[PDB]
Amino acid sequence: EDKSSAQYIDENCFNLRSTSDSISFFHGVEKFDGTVSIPETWAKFSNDNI
Amino acid sequence: ERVNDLAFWKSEITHELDEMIGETNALTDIKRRLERGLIETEGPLQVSR
Amino acid sequence: YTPRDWDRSNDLQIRNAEASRLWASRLTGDSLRIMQDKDQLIHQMQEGTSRNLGQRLSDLGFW
Amino acid sequence: KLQTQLAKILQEIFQAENTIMLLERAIVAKEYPLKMAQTMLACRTRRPNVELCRDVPQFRLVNEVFTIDDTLQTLKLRLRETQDTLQLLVMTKSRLEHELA
């Protein structure tokens, strides 16, 4: 379920483009840093579960 | 990627095509201005003649 | 009062005008070039954006 | 001679003005992809738990935000410069008019 939610969210962000209007100015998204893991660690996590 | 390469050459072609048109009119203006001096020169030629 | 220095003064004014005009023309040329460069750079970088998002979605689907 | 130079000053004054107008038209065209990137980064914040990650798309999205910021700053500098050149050129036209008078 977690990966399905992430896939849907990333699919939406890929679907939106410069022509779309649901956009907004979101200042500071660069300076904010919220991260828990790297892709290699995520892949290892899924591998260990399997 | 082929579309993106196709897009790149489209933008490059467009910019140079823009400038070429910008040169033809500037050369066209210098043509009419050059030609207009000939018609005036018949004036002082007549006075001198 | 300055019989022939008058000609030097008019010459000075004229050449000042010419130099300013030449600099202006150079600046217009550079402005057009930098505009084209920035436009192309932004488009190349956004298509790289799209390709990398697509790759990540593919890997997520596989897992 | 002053007449001909005044005419040339007129040419360059409009070239400066047209440059100003096309450049302001360019900045607003450049504005939108920045907020596109910011919306995408908000969606990245929406990612849940482990799937929220420092992936290549997120890193290069941050780089994209930085790059559009830089291009906006450079374009604004060029605007200011060409405005200054236009003002100077109008001043030269004024001097040539006075000398012709």
Side-chain angles (χ1 to χ4, degrees):
Chain A
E1 158 284 345
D2 212 314
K3 196 174 313 303
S4 299
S5 302
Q7 157 266 313
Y8 203 106
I9 295 176
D10 293 8
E11 175 179 346
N12 305 329
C13 88
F14 168 83
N15 288 341
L16 306 184
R17 275 113 201 178
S18 306
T19 62
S20 303
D21 194 89
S22 58
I23 74 196
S24 161
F25 202 124
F26 297 124
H27 37 259
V29 286
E30 168 264 296
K31 49 77 175 182
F32 164 66
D33 45 284
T35 64
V36 76
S37 316
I38 85 185
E40 323 176 15
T41 48
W42 148 71
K44 175 179 180 177
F45 171 81
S46 42
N47 159 70
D48 304 316
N49 227 4
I50 286 182
Chain B
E1 304 137 30
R2 198 32 160 207
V3 154
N4 296 328
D5 303 0
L6 273 189
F8 152 74
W9 298 106
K10 285 268 299 174
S11 73
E12 191 274 9
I13 280 271
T14 308
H15 196 53
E16 179 73 8
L17 178 59
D18 169 10
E19 313 315 298
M20 171 46 39
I21 301 169
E23 185 75 11
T24 59
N25 58 45
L27 203 57
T28 305
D29 296 358
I30 212 75
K31 161 205 174 307
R32 310 165 183 179
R33 204 179 78 179
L34 176 46
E35 176 281 310
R36 194 154 34 228
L38 276 298
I39 318 287
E40 312 213 8
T41 300
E42 152 151 20
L45 188 37
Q46 181 64 29
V47 166
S48 99
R49 264 191 61 260
Chain C
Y1 175 71
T2 67
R4 79 219 155 287
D5 161 67
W6 152 87
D7 173 60
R8 324 209 310 142
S9 174
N10 324 117
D11 190 295
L12 154 56
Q13 288 280 62
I14 289 164
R15 44 171 300 300
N16 292 6
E18 315 317 313
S20 273
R21 159 196 48 118
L22 193 32
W23 149 41
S25 312
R26 273 128 52 180
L27 199 76
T28 88
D30 305 314
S31 99
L32 282 190
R33 174 51 161 111
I34 187 175
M35 161 175 171
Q36 182 50 241
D37 174 3
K38 290 315 164 189
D39 169 15
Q40 163 55 351
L41 169 139
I42 220 67
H43 222 89
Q44 188 171 57
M45 190 215 96
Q46 74 95 57
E47 48 212 50
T49 309
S50 76
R51 90 189 267 182
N52 200 253
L53 310 194
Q55 159 270 344
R56 189 62 173 181
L57 287 200
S58 175
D59 217 39
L60 296 188
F62 152 78
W63 268 118
Chain D
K1 264 193 186 142
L2 295 173
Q3 297 157 2
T4 314
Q5 304 337 100
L6 183 66
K8 303 274 307 159
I9 298 314
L10 290 188
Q11 293 150 13
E12 287 65 320
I13 288 191
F14 184 69
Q15 307 325 284
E17 295 172 0
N18 160 59
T19 305
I20 298 162
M21 162 55 58
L22 65 90
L23 275 193
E24 36 206 290
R25 212 220 46 67
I27 295 188
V28 182
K30 299 306 158 303
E31 165 66 16
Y32 332 107
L34 204 39
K35 60 192 173 177
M36 310 325 167
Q38 290 160 296
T39 60
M40 301 334 153
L41 288 161
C43 296
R44 311 316 300 275
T45 70
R46 205 153 41 170
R47 289 171 313 177
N49 202 19
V50 152
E51 283 68 4
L52 163 152
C53 54
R54 232 169 50 233
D55 45 349
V56 185
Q58 171 110 55
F59 151 78
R60 54 151 312 281
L61 212 53
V62 171
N63 180 53
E64 153 185 4
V65 155
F66 152 71
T67 298
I68 310 185
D69 173 32
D70 163 61
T71 203
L72 289 186
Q73 175 187 301
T74 310
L75 262 280
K76 288 156 190 172
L77 188 77
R78 187 36 45 72
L79 263 56
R80 217 215 53 75
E81 200 49 48
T82 196
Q83 292 157 357
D84 173 88
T85 321
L86 168 66
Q87 303 146 3
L88 173 92
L89 287 206
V90 175
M91 150 149 182
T92 83
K93 161 192 175 295
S94 83
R95 323 153 198 172
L96 283 190
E97 290 166 303
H98 166 57
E99 296 306 303
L100 271 193

